[PDB]
Design a protein around this ligand. Structure first.
Ligand code: NA
Ligand code: NA
Ligand code: NA
Ligand code: NA
Ligand SMILES: [O-]
Lengths: 322, 322
């Protein structure tokens, strides 16, 4: 919320158990690596995946360790953990006593009580199996949570939080990757188009603007076959949209045309991850390099001036702001 | 948010300039009176009316001093103030840089930037004048702010926060007093019925349950002619509704009939304000007594057991949790 500190989730290598958590302070430009291991004398696990901060507690999703850790955002000390998660993706709080945890390889969204760390129920997604089930990012509008369904799916689902039931769905292009809501209460999702030879599909990917109140598609911007966009996101004001599509792209949330010029042109760095400071609009991009050594983060001002570079953990893939 | 500290706004006597601010610590059962004056060497003013707390800053609305003071919730020292307000009632933040302040004797809701303390615009309410205009409490559902219109009015208005315009209205009984939203995203408002000899009107007052998503009245509970109810309030979970109508009344938000038995019996005084601890469900009742002598606060458990009683300022009518 403040933008005064940045957490970086380093995925590590799948099944090698070498995920780590980094913390960067934009004011001092100092990075700290392996902070969870150093504070807890315990490895973070396998494939760190996402994180949210809520009232000085950070909730770190470790996808292939089937766990979310609650940690102090000051000391990085574990205060609790939720285990038993099929393959968790994101956590979104409904209240202090209720949160939803999305999953891959499950047709259910898990409901937890964050005060007890216990799973209290499940939301069954329609027309989904354990074999190809996928739920991902969540946004909330009024009483409803919207969630994109990514791997081998092509839908946004609408959940009534007063009943914990899916009440509607919206079909989009195959594999919407991410989901955010702007200052006009329009949701944005960008699909990745599958891939050549996919058992599911391969098509031109698209960026959609969807009214949150009415769940209606308002705009669809189509890209080229072969593009695999990802990580649509917003600045702090919710009025500038960013995403990855080889380059880093941005546009005003009121634009009716996608710009021809990107924010950061792709040349010598493959952009593995992206975030925007909610405080000053700085843009951060992750470089996974060779997927074996420390990856690095580049920090740009909103005007494109490179102001910092810092090495983190292995395959930095997600960000979370204090 | 925590429920560890309670502010009490003592209205003082109208036009006497003797409003004060009190702070109560439920753990020690210690009250501190005249805290604003003690911390700032400045009288609070005339008709302190309401307060909200946002990120350790308290925003104290002083209706007949035309000002909202931003104070530290630790030291109670002023950090800034918003002046130039016709006769402010409540403040509701839309974002860090945008808040709405309702008014009596104005047809406009003021828009402010709380970071600069400046008035940045106005929301014109339809079919309202400076002479009898009234906007009062606010709740937000999605992109919309709903507001009750109290003195010489009989409406709830719906404001689109993305345009800062009134986009809809709902007629209710005359003079809806207060507005809350429960855990089912139903709004509740209770009218006072005017009074016999009012220049505006007089009728049986009612409690309404209104769907926030569709702005539709779902339930209307009518009371006896001559009652003048006020101050709907919710517990922390948003599942028990309380209000004043001589006695203190409560019911589950899922109840289909108003109860015949009250929570706290009338005692020949003037219950004037009400709050529920969001931490433990204790119920606090502000008693203005006779509107002249020093008021008292009664603290009860959610089960009706008296826990404490303490003296505050003159006409204690509003509460805010730290
Ligand atoms: Na709505
Ligand atoms: Na590049
Ligand atoms: Na009516
Ligand atoms: Na209490
Ligand atoms: O009154």
């Amino acid at each position: 919320a403040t933008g005064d500190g940045l957490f970086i989730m380093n995925e590590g290598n799948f099944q090698y158990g070498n995920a780590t958590l980094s913390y960067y302070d934009p004011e001092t430009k100092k990075v700290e690596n392996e902070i969870f291991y150093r504070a807890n004398a315990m490895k973070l696990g396998d494939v760190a995946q996402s994180m949210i901060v809520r009232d000085t507690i950070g909730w770190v999703v470790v996808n292939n360790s089937h766990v979310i850790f609650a940690i102090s955002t000051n000391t990085f000390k574990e205060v609790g953990r939720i285990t038993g998660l099929t393959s968790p993706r994101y956590i979104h709080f409904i209240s202090d006593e209720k949160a939803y945890i999305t999953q891959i390889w499950d047709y259910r969204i898990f409901i937890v009580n964050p005060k007890t760390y216990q799973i209290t129920g499940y939301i069954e997604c329609p027309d989904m199996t354990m074999e190809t089930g996928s739920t991902e990012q969540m946004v909330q509008y009024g009483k409803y949570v919207y969630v994109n369904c990514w791997s081998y799916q092509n839908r946004i689902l609408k959940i009534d939080t007063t009943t914990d039931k899916v009440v509607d769905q919206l079909t989009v292009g195959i594999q919407p990757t991410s989901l955010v809501m702007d200052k006009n209460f329009k949701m944005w999702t960008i699909t990745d188009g599958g891939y050549k030879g996919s058992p599911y599909g391969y098509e031109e990917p698209s960026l959609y603007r969807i009214d949150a109140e009415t769940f209606k598609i308002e705009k669809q911007f189509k890209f080229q076959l072969g593009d695999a966009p990802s990580e649509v996101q917003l600045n702090g004001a919710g009025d500038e949209l960013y995403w990855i599509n080889k380059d880093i792209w941005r546009m005003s949330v009121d634009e009716e045309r996608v710009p021809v010029r990107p924010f950061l042109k792709y040349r010598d760095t493959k952009y593995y991850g992206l975030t925007v400071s909610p405080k000053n609009g700085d843009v951060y991009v992750a470089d996974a390099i060779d997927y074996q050594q420390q990856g690095m983060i580049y920090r740009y001002t909103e005007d494109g001036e490179l102001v910092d570079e810092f090495y983190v953990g292995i395959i930095p893939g997600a960000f979370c702001w204090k």
